[PDB]
């Protein structure tokens, strides 16, 4: 008869407890394991895979394959914009349903930097240059090329190699950032501008298209697991 006293917090069912439990079928021998290829060990081995970013929604391309293409045509005037969006990878409706965005909508805080792989899926004799700018917040969106070249930017040329990875850095006052749309920890905007035109020879089509990927760096991290807002239910199937 050892004397004990029961602390508060007993006879409860916490849904994230770590306790042992008596087995139902004792002395069960499981079937032995196998070297199945492709063992995932961490969910940060999924954010380091690229996925195409549907950056061309516009209410008519959402139910199609046109949502992944950015139309790039041989313009007549110079210094025009190609696209642009704020960088909220759990709150914006462009980086939402990508492979990175459906991992961040299980967690609450995130950190680290983001890679943005582009690809010129155009013709072979058509060349050009692009300016991939990322402006940190505090001001509005940039509106001219003269205002966007002050931020962080690379200048991309298309040749034999047809990719360019703008790696946006981690410039923030806090050690983490929310995934829901907040104003305190916004992460600026990412734009893309014509440097020169898209020149093209005779008897070639003009409107070349560009794809865009997204991925995480080697130093990405998350925190505070929550439940997703993307799946509803009203009955049992």
């Amino acid at each position: 008869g050892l004397p004990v006293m029961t602390t508060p917090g007993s006879t409860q069912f916490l849904t994230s407890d770590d306790f042992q439990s008596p087995s139902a079928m004792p002395q069960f021998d499981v079937t032995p394991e196998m070297q199945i290829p492709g063992r995932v060990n961490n969910l940060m081995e999924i954010a380091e895979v690229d996925s195409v970013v549907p950056v061309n929604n516009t209410e008519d391309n959402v139910s199609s394959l046109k949502a992944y293409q950015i139309p790039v045509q041989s313009n007549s005037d110079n210094g025009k914009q190609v696209f642009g969006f704020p960088l909220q990878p759990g709150a914006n409706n462009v980086l939402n349903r990508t492979l990175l965005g459906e991992i961040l909508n299980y967690y609450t805080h995130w950190s680290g930097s983001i890679k943005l792989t582009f690809m010129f899926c155009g013709s072979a004799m058509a060349t050009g240059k692009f300016l991939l700018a990322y402006s940190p917040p505090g001001a509005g969106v940039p509106k001219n090329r003269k205002d966007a070249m002050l931020g962080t930017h690379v200048i991309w040329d298309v040749g034999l190699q047809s990719s360019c990875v703008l790696c946006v850095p981690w410039i923030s006052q806090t050690h983490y950032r929310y995934v829901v749309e907040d104003e305190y920890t916004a992460a600026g905007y990412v734009t893309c501008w014509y440097q020169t035109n898209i020149v093209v020879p005779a008897d070639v089509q003009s409107s070349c298209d560009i794809l865009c990927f997204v991925s995480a760096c080697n130093d990405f991290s998350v925190r505070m697991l929550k439940d997703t807002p993307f799946i509803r239910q009203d009955t049992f199937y």
Partner: protein
Amino acid sequence: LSITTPEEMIEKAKGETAYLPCKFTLSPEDQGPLDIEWLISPDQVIILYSGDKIYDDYYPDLKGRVHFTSNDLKSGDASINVTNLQLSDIGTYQCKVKKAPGVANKKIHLVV
């Protein structure tokens, strides 16, 4: 949820168009559906916003004279434009916004 100025006094003249602002921000816990009301006590609803569709035939004296202003109501705009102000529009107007789990009021006193 929080409104910029929960009470003030607005002074306008007859025949003009009043502009009763109601702006807000969004704390990160607010994830439910949106709800926006407007009241009058010269406690009658004059306009609604719920389920993304506007219902606005509620007050007989202000029939077809009040409208929302912006097209981006889920960004922090709830201002209304009261057209054709008359002498009988004296009363406190109450902008009730309720996105769960938040709720806020704004008592606008309008005197012409």
